[PDB]
Design a protein around this ligand. Structure first.
Ligand SMILES: [Mg+2]
Ligand SMILES: [Mg+2]
Ligand SMILES: [Mg+2]
Ligand SMILES: [Mg+2]
Ligand SMILES: [Mg+2]
Ligand SMILES: [Mg+2]
Ligand SMILES: [Mg+2]
Ligand SMILES: [Mg+2]
Ligand SMILES: [Mg+2]
Ligand SMILES: [Mg+2]
Ligand SMILES: [Mg+2]
Lengths: 228, 259, 148
RNA sequence: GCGAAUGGCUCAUUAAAACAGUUAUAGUUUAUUUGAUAAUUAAAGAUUACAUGGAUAACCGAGCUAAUUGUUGGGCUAAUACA
RNA sequence: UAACUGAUCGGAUCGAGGUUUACCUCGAUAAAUCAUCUAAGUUUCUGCCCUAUCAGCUCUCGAUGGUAGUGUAUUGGACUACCAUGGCAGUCACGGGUAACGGAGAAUUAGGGUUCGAUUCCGGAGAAGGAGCCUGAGAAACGGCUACUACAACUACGGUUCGGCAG
């Protein structure tokens, strides 16, 4: 059996082989999204805790969660399902899926390290994956950068991350994100102008109403004075 | 039929456009707008066929997408190739300062009436509905799909307002009664112009009115196709030159070729 | 000699050109090459040669006449902005339109059948002559121009 | 987002059916168009308005199938997206 | 004027040109209501070829009408419950046939007729056969999905197909 092991902090991913029927007896008849002791697997796994996050059939079929059965079942997948992609708006498909329950028919299991024990596997500890794509939204910057709410927009401006890199051509370049949500003069102007539109609405209407009214009384004065 | 139709075939495009039978398969389907599809003269025809300012399709696009804002309808810019310029509209081309009014001649094809600057401010409007609106505000509605608020209360339904397009202020109006001047928007009597003799209301369905012209030939048409041209014998518009009098082909041939 | 009667003249500010119907009389000669008709027309109307586009000529049966059309743009700026691309090739300004369809449809094939990264890698290889490159050659030719 | 409901093809069904010309909708629906409206942002709760909140794709990384415009886990950040 | 719902709307969005920049002038777009365009659903009246080796037809769950409902975008036996016994027919009902889609039209034509219209335009219908859906403003879509009947393509046999020339 093959185990795709991912762990969240480092962003570690390695995948491992076990041919022992005895070693793999553990995951059998365990539903997905379950906690596993790493000890009963191997020695390098002493003290480890895994979450069974999914897996794949011999035939490639991924496990849907909540489908509770061991082996494949055919479903009608509407939009917003795992195992599925909508080609069109209303879209449904008969799809073959793998159940939640782990059998021997599974070539692959996806494992989430929850608690790592004393035992040290290389790619979990060794690696630190970098930070690419810093925060974009104004408030997200302020937060993740530790800035006050009362603070000036220019402090947000000055604290956005820079990216620096070397072009495959060998050139030297630097790229910056744009801040969305940012409070700029333009936003405030647009706001002022909209409120203007409103106030103009009821003003103009009022002035019309009164113009009509006075014209009216004049016109009825003439209309009744035409009668005698 | 699975919903809306987006195309128009040349054979089916109205005779009033005078398109070539052989010119293609399709013609331009008029856009949803102020005027109906059959009462539309679209912009693309206005430019390509009539003014010849556009020689082909690409050209029309050029004119209407050029940042320079070339064409105007009732004072407001239009960039839409299929915009339904309808009856009584004033279309103005900024580069030449040409100001035309959209009309039917006696033969029922579409014509551009050249207007001087004083004419081009004014446009004639015909009352469709009259109601009390929300907040108890009286309102009025027009053939070109205007909604006018606080109308002069004397204005009845099916009148003709003379509308200042600079001021968006109705100036003078006149209603449908014996003795006023009409133009006829739709009919076999399309394009003819005349003094209303009287009106008969049949009250189940369709009210018919009768007409005379300067020469004294009577007409009749349903009320819906009458458009009022002003008070008296005088029209508030410069008419394409027939003056609104139909000519017998005998009259036509005589005057034209001297028989 | 070539005589040119100039016939129907519409002044078109919208596209800022003059539109023209032409009548060429070549009583002893074959139909006139456009180079000559251009040059004679420019001689008449005093404008530049490359400011005038000449198109759609019909020699009649028996060969005394041809009827054609002409365009005269106010500045070659406009002319360079209005005439479509196949014409700028007739005037040698632009280039060849290379074979589009086959390529484009096989690209459509592969594109539909994969996702983003690979798709971009295919788009890098597209055989098109870009709108960018068009406006670039246009501008450059407008920069190599000399007024008469 | 929008479109994919047009277009193109065919005449198998179909004899008051469909269709045609005439009507009704005061018995209805209509995305895109044109014109006109809009003072109060229910209550509880919440309440920054110099402007609120949490996600995800592309991307990076690890996979499964003999097989497809199949998709599974993991690490990122936007929106006129979702609140 | 009562209340009721909160499942309606009441802009946390974008450009551009700038008077030198804290303020102007043009626009893009989202969306509610009412008109308006566009198109549709239903709908009034009248009009089809051959046949009596079709004279009665329709009504056990709707046939004609009446009531309350229900459902729908709306009207309606469209559907349900109760009630009444109607509705159509020699002025041809009902039922067969059509190598029948209907028109605009076409070939012939002294006049009157005869015979065609699958096929440019407008309607209608269908996407191998049936049914059923999703999503939309609009669909029973078919160059969308689900199933069956009958078939088409891969397969390492376990699976799969952006499988549907009346484009
Ligand atoms: Mg359009
Ligand atoms: Mg009525
Ligand atoms: Mg080209
Ligand atoms: Mg029958
Ligand atoms: Mg009927
Ligand atoms: Mg993730
Ligand atoms: Mg600025
Ligand atoms: Mg027939
Ligand atoms: Mg058809
Ligand atoms: Mg119909
Ligand atoms: Mg074929």
């Amino acid at each position: 059996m093959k185990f795709n092991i991912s762990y969240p902090l480092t962003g570690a991913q390695k995948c491992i082989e076990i041919d022992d029927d005895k070693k793999c007896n553990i995951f059998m008849d365990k539903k997905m999204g379950q906690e596993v002791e790493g000890d009963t697997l191997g020695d390098e796994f002493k003290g480890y805790v895994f979450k069974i996050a999914g897996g794949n059939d011999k035939d490639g079929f991924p496990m849907k969660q909540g489908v509770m059965v061991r082996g494949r079942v055919r479903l009608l997948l509407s939009e917003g399902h795992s195992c599925f992609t909508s080609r069109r708006s209303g879209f449904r498909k008969r799809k073959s899926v793998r159940g939640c329950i782990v059998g021997p028919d599974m070539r692959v299991l996806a494992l989430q390290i929850v608690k790592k024990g004393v035992a040290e596997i290389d790619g979990l500890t060794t690696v630190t994956l970098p930070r690419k794509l810093g925060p974009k939204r104004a408030n997200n910057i302020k937060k993740l950068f530790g800035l006050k709410k009362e603070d000036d927009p220019i402090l947000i401006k000055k604290s956005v991350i820079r990216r620096t890199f070397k072009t495959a051509k060998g050139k030297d370049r630097t790229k910056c994100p744009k801040i969305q949500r940012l409070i700029t003069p333009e936003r405030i102007l647009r706001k002022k102008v909209y409120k203007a539109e409103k106030t103009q609405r009821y003003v103009k209407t009022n002035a019309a109403k009164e113009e009509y009214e006075k014209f009216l009384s004049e016109w009825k004065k003439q209309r009744a004075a035409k009668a005698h | 039929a699975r919903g809306p139709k987006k195309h128009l075939k040349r054979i089916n495009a109205p005779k009033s456009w005078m398109l070539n039978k052989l010119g293609g398969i399709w013609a331009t389907r008029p856009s949803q707008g102020p005027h109906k599809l059959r009462e539309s003269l679209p912009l693309s025809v206005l430019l390509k066929e009539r003014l010849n300012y556009a020689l082909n399709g690409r050209d029309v696009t050029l004119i209407l997408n050029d940042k320079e804002q070339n064409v105007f309808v009732d004072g407001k810019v239009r960039r839409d190739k299929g915009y339904p310029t309808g009856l009584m509209d004033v279309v103005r081309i900024e580069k030449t300062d040409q100001s035309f009014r959209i009309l039917y001649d006696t033969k029922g094809r579409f014509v551009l009436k050249s207007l001087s600057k004083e004419e081009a401010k004014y446009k004639l409007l015909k009352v469709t509905a009259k109601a009390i609106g929300p907040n108890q505000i009286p309102y009025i509605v027009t053939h070109d799909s205007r909604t006018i608020r606080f109308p002069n209360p004397e204005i009845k339904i099916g009148d003709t307002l003379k509308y200042d397009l600079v001021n968006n202020k109705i100036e003078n109006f006149a209603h449908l009664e014996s003795g006023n001047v009409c133009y006829i928007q739709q009919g076999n009597n399309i394009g003819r112009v005349g003094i209303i003799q009287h009106i008969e209301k049949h009250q189940g369905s369709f009210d018919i009115c009768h007409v005379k012209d300067a020469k004294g030939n009577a007409f009749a048409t349903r009320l819906g196709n009458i458009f009022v041209l002003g008070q008296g014998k005088k029209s508030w518009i410069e008419l394409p030159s027939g003056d609104g009098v139909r000519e017998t082909i005998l009259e036509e041939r005589k005057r034209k070729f001297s028989y | 000699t070539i005589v040119i009667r100039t016939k129907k003249i519409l002044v078109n500010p919208l596209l800022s050109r003059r539109q023209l119907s032409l009548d060429v009389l070549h009583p002893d000669s074959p139909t006139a090459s456009k180079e000559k008709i251009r040059e004679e027309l420019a001689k008449q109307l005093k404008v530049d040669a490359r400011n005038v586009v000449v198109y759609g000529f019909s020699t009649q049966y028996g060969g005394g006449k041809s009827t054609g059309f002409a365009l005269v743009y106010d500045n070659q700026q406009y002319l360079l902005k209005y005439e479509p691309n196949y014409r700028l090739r007739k005037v040698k300004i632009l280039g060849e339109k290379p074979n589009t369809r086959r390529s484009f449809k096989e690209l459509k094939r592969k594109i539909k059948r994969t996702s983003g990264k690979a798709i971009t890698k295919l788009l890098s290889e597209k055989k098109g002559d870009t709108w960018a490159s068009v406006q670039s050659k246009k501008s450059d030719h407008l920069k190599n121009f000399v007024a008469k």
